[PDB]
RNA sequence: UAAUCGAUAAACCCCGAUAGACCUUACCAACCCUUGCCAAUUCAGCCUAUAUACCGCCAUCUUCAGCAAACCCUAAAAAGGAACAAUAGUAAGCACAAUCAUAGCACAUAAAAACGUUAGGUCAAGGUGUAGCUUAUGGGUUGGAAAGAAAUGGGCUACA
């Protein structure tokens, strides 16, 4: 299939120039970005599956990595380990062999000659390197891999890094390393805010259980909560809604120290009360320092509640309840 | 409109694509018959389709109902019949039957449907029409001079003329429309009392009250087409007299200068002039195709120019065409497949080739399929400037477009190669037109031998012998023997390969045939042998030739 | 109106414009079992007769 | 086990098309409808109609075009004038095609009070997407 | 006897324009669209299928015919029709104070033979009782007149009529109720006075 | 190169009675798919920046409405199966519009409305006052 | 389009108190036609002629039974 | 033919219906009011007993359109629990899919 | 009327039960005839009942350079046309109802001994067209299946051979007879023996062997003595090249071994 | 009682029916019509039998993972095909998984769940092969289709 692809490039390019002249852009700076706004547009699809939408790629992307030829006319394979199934994979392992191999004579002879000038490059935890997984060694060795094969390459990669590294063979060890996101899971922080010469002034969002609650605080007024244009004692006659208003303000000592008004919407009297507290610890985050917003996070003030009621199931009652199983 | 795109009304799928003219004229024949087979489905049970679903309420889609309503009432029974022939005729029978008195106006409907349909059978209702009851001579000549003058008796309308000028009654712009055309199409050894008819009826017509419409202007002009060719001063005279009154010719009026004018320009050519500066002044305007008979106008205002051989003009004549109307003015595509053809003739050879492939991609795949003539012309017009880079491209399309004319455009659409030169970037163009036309005939036609010829030195310049010399074994071996000038070019290029193995079974078959210049193959093939060193082979083919 | 439909496509049947499979099987069908010999009886005899 | 609009494995040799491989549970995942129309929204009407006059022109259909049809045809209505998209099998003559086309294209308008398109895509085969 | 015939793309040129070749709206025939376009759940060791005898391009709606060019040309033939809006009432604020009396229709399109609609009918009328010449005892009275179709904080009086068959028939009986509760709020009768 | 000339022949007439005033115009188009609204309005707003109309554009909540269906066909009630409709609603919102102007701006937006959408078109017209009602006394 | 209602407008619909003059005004016909009427009225369905037959079918009902109306006790026209 | 016999007599019932519509609205609106005299409504009631019975809009039942099931259809689509699900799976029926939440 | 309905294929495939329920483990096999007409075979799409000729479809588009009209044929001409397709289904019956008898190598109703063909060519290219197998006996096999039970399986022992020494055998199992018997083609070429024959026509001497339980004692014969063995040895030693011999088979008969 | 039918172990028992005063209704008693819905047909029509002939749709194993075309091997082969410091296994495909939906992730739910077992349910959604009705097992109108001696399944109300 290597003359198909090649005829699928030109086709590629003929139609890629046919779409920048019928949209208007220049087909110099034609790129993906517009060839797939330009698809949307002219197919738009409406399908939940994003591969079953329309798309035209360059044809490397759509059409998998394609086995070269292995022998030439008169039938001889051109690499010396095409009989051994895996001809990639096993000069790969030979490679590594190798160069474990001679970085091992290398260090030897320097042992013998009493020099060391080899540094322990193995480390790369600032970094954030991992190793290939098996998808990506795959697509790097056009023939397909096993788990055994390649816990057997991971292993000899570790016991080649374990060894005083060449010049040489780092840049070979590094390009099977991988880098990994970063991990923190530290929210932003609001500015504080000031609007109407009003100072101390932070806003915060919250949802629990189909209510939503916004909340307004400023810092600078005595502790009292407005909620829905009523005071909280008022709108909350249960005492354990008012301990969930109480509860953030109680983590932080602040409370008599900021002013708060609030508007909740949906649910009950419970779910009001966990939206107002969420929306309430997250507009508090401003107001204190970076230490104790995140022990508010670990006490489970930042966090949602994904407890949302589920849908009941045909032929049960609530979803778990079934009916009356008679066995006989 | 689209170039590489087909018409709208053929499916765009490319199976149902038509590839020549006759094909695309029978895939719209063949929807319009599917179209009347079901709209006679629909009047043959109308009971299917009474059901509404429409709000508009759109007729256009309801059938249509054959029947008439009333058939007890005579008075109620003709109405209905004479809008929808044979039926017609028994009508006046059954009202007849009970003698019910008729009126002017109920048998002027009766005499107009057999006039517009329909030799003894006329007679007889015109004398029905005439003896039965006192008719109003308005609604007589409407019917009688329209329908005797396609049966070949106009001597009826000159004798009811006399009635209808007695009977104190005026004659309608529409009696002499016909009148001069009965007058006119009897011609006995005179055509001077002939045109002074006419020319007394149109003096009559002024003093009658009644002005004469176009009509009788295009007319007259109709008339003065078939007897005289010399007739172009009252012509002229009435084309001038046509714009005093105020009102605009039509197209056909200037049609019927054109044609006379193209009748007599074959011997003097001083009459073109009085057709190229007529067309300036009406190309000015915006027309409308108001008169049914302008689809022969530009099939007379553009031969003339094809004739001629004028360019500027074909221009001109074109931006007319698509001014106003580019589709409006055309009705069968019998003359637009004329005009099309003679109009590409003149864009080919003498304007500049570039301007010659613009034009033809636009016409040719797009609009309709040229005849066998422009095929000449557009080989005609690639040796005069020495263009072979778009000869495979010509001829891809000729297999499609000329296929049925194949077997005599052939042997002219390779005479080309003959006369330029083989540029040595160009072998795969002269390979593979030159295998995909023998691929064909012998899998089969008559095949030329002058295309042997041209491809003997198609492959002289490529350096491939190899395959120039099996194509000469397959006409060799089919009863028909070309000349010897193309066995003494080949046999320079066997020498020039080093091949004497080819010689000597080209002479031993050619001579055997009695060639004319078997003294020159022979003489030719010892030149070759001395410097192949087979010299014991030189005498071996004389001593066959001998037995 | 499922009579005009039927009768529609019934005469198109018989017109031979529209081809029925199931009417068609439903004929071979026929044609099978009265070959066979068990056809449908005349109106009239088939109680007493 | 569900059936419902699902073709059984065979040994794996018979050929099947897209629309015939993707079980109904698939339905604007992975496939989209045959038919596009209005009756099926919220505060829309008249959809029995539709489906009735739908229905209708399948069954017309697959026996105007009888062997020569390759999958299910696209119904499209869009402002009072209903587009009939069909894949056929290049079986029959052009000559046949377009007088069959004309026919139908006047006989529907007639029959249903509306201006109707048709238009025919030619296939040299059925197309196969799954085993064949 | 069967022929091939190759499709446009071969014969489309890199320059020539899109909407000439797709003026209306269009079934998406592959044969005159160049783009290869492949659509489709693509197989394990597959691709999507081709333009091709995809059902899946057919399916969906083309908007071939709407490409950004073609609809700048579009627009510019249509700039004739229109006419130019007065800069007169850019705010709101003056168009309350010289057109008061607000309009609202509905209209609704949906494909089908049919286009009768029982919701085209609804009319409705908004006027602000802040630009009329209601005193404080036609005011006082035109309230009670009209119940709940008035609001106090808006003070925007609504008129809801859908009993008139047609739409004309219905904004003029909302045209009529508004005269008449305009003028039977001045008439001050014998039984106002208890 | 074979383009032909006059082709614009348009018949416009300008009538003396007064134009009719629009306040606000809303085109609510409601379909089931989402890449096809979001096509729909970008071709609008494309169409409507054109002739300078300053379109607004915000997409009203979404509607599901499902059903239940038995399952099998003679006797399964415990197994059922669920239907789903669901209608995506795309709001267009144009302000100071003109008679003439609202005409063909609808005239472009209704001739290419794709066939799987439906559209509301609600028009807030606007008038001074009523003759009956500029100065009376009963 | 293409619906005019046969060119009537709306005091053709909801005024019918001018068809109400073959009854009697002060008994018991007046009360029960005057929901009828407002029925009417605010029917958009039914056409002015159409709402023109139900009255008349009212008119001639009534001035047929004409003895249950006399035994009624009441007097009516 | 029609679907079955139930459809042909269901038809019959509903044109039936259709022709005996305003008659019946008219005696109805001597029956359901208070304003007349009881007299009269007796002889209102005789006069719609006399009426033909399968005038009546209280028989029509609403059967499928393809199989004419008497129970298991939906009034929107006219169509039984069945062929309405036959339709759907095929893809058939616009904006119906499976329900998945 | 119309709506109720189906297509042929269902209706096909409801009429046959070719997925019958009963047909699976075992409960049929009573009538095992099972035959689909296609219908839609020779019905022209132009044809029908009242004989109209369209232009389009019956007959020609265009005819003496004009275009025909909506004609009717006449009675008699309908009568002959129905006549003639009435013919064809006779026609197409006489060739459904006929069977050609099979080959009996053996006996009637065995495969024991009957051509199977020449093997199928290998993957590089090479033909046997002058090899010639035969099959040497037919086995169904039956397996205990966890959810179906008894799997049968169709064993076939096939012997390949050219005439001049070449020759040998293989054991082809599938869960269809020609599966069977195309395993076994292919796969008897890859296992060929060579034997050695005296004047091509006898062994060179008499061998007597004993195998895992059957003894085999065969005798060199003269050109007279022409094939006296087994029934199977004879169809072995055909295809082997050997035109005499005397064999004996004593003990067990089992033909594999 | 003159007065339907089917389901009737897990997988039936507020099940066909998201639904019965006439109609629905296929049940019965009284009465009428027999080329009797359609353009026509020595034809229509049958809720007549066969779910042990079917298709269409499902139930159970079943959130179990196996099924399986083409090959190859076994000192024969009914059948089996594995040792990762690897001892004969490659394997397209269907399953599983992933993806999709519950408009952001993760989880969960939903959805999906092959080949087959139960001759499992459905001729009464609809058509149907075979065998049976045709002045009747077909088509219409009216009136009735109770009632509880008793047992039991599932729910609501409570027994505070
Ligand atoms: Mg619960
Ligand atoms: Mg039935
Ligand atoms: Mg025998
Ligand atoms: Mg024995
Ligand atoms: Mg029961
Ligand atoms: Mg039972
Ligand atoms: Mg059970
Ligand atoms: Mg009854
Ligand atoms: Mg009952
Ligand atoms: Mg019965
Ligand atoms: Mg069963
Ligand atoms: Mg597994
Ligand atoms: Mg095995
Ligand atoms: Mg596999
Ligand atoms: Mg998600
Ligand atoms: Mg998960
Ligand atoms: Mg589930
Ligand atoms: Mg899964
Ligand atoms: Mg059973
Ligand atoms: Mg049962
Ligand atoms: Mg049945
Ligand atoms: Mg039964
Ligand atoms: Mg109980
Ligand atoms: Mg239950």
Known sequence: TVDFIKKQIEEFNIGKRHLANMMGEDPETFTQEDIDRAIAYLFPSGLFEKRARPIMKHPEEIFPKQRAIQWGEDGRPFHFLFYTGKQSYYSLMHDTYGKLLDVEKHHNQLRAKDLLAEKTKILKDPIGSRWLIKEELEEMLVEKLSDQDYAQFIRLLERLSALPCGATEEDFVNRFRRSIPIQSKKQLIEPLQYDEQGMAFSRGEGKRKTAKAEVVVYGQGSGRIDVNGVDYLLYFPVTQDREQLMFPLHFLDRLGKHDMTCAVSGGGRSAQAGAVRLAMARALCSFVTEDEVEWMRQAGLLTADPRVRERKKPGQEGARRKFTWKKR | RDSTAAPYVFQDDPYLIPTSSVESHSFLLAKKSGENAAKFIINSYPKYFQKDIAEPHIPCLMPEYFEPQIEDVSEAALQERIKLXXXXXXXXXXXXXXXXXXXXXXXXXXXXXXXXXXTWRTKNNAERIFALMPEKNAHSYCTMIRGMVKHQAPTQALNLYTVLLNNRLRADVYTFNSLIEATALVVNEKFEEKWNNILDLLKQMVTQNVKPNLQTFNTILKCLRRFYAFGKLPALQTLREMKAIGIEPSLATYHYVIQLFYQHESPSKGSSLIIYDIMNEVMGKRFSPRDPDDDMFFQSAMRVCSSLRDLELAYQVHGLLNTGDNWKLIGSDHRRNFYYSKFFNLLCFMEQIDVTLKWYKDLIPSVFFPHSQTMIDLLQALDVANRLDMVPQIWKDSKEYGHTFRNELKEEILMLMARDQHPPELQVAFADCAADIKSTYESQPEWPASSLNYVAVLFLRAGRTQEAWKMLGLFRKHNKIPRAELLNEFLDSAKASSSPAQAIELVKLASAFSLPVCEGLTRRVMAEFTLTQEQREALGELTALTS | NHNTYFALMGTLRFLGLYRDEHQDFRDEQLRLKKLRGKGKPRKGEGKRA | ?132 | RRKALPPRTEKMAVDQDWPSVYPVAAPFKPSAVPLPVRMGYPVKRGVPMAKEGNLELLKIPNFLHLTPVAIKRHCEALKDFCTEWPAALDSDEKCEKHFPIEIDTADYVSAGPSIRNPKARVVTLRVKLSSLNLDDHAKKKLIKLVGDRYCKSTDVLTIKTDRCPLKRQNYDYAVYLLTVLYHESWKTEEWEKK | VDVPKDMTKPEITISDEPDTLYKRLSVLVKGHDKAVLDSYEYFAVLAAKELGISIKVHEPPRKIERFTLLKSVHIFKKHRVQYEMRTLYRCLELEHLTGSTADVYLEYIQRNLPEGVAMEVTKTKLEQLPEHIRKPIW | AGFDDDGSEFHEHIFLDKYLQDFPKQGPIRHFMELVTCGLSKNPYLSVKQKVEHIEWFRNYFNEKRVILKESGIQLN | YYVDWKMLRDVKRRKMAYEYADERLRINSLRKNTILPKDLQEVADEEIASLPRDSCPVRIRNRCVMTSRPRGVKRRWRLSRIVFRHLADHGQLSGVQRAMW | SFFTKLTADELWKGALAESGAGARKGRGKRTKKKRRKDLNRGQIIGEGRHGFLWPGLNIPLMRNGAVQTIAQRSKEDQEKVEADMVQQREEWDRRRKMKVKRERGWSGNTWGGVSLGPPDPGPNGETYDDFDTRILEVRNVFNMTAKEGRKRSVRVLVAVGNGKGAAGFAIGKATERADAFRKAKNRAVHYLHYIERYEDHTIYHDISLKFKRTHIKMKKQPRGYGLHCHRAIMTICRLIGIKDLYAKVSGSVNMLN
């Not at chain 4, 390759?70 to 290049?90: S, T």
Request: positive net charge; hydrophobic residues 40%; aromatic residues 10%.
């Open chain 4, 1 to 132: 086990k569900n059936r419902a609009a699902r073709v059984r494995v065979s040994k794996g040799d018979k050929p099947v098309t897209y629309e015939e491989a993707h079980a109904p549970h698939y339905i604007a995942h992975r496939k989209g409808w045959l038919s596009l129309h209005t009756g099926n929204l919220d505060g829309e009407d008249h959809a029995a109609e539709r489906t009735v006059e739908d229905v209708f022109l399948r069954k017309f259909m697959l026996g105007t075009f009888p062997g020569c049809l390759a999958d299910q045809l696209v119904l499209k209505r869009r402002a009072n004038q209903l587009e009939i998209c069909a894949l056929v099998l290049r079986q029959l003559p052009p000559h046949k095609f377009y007088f069959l086309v004309g026919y139908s294209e006047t006989l529907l308008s007639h029959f249903y009070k509306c201006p109707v398109h048709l238009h025919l895509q030619t296939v040299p085969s059925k197309v196969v997407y799954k085993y064949i």
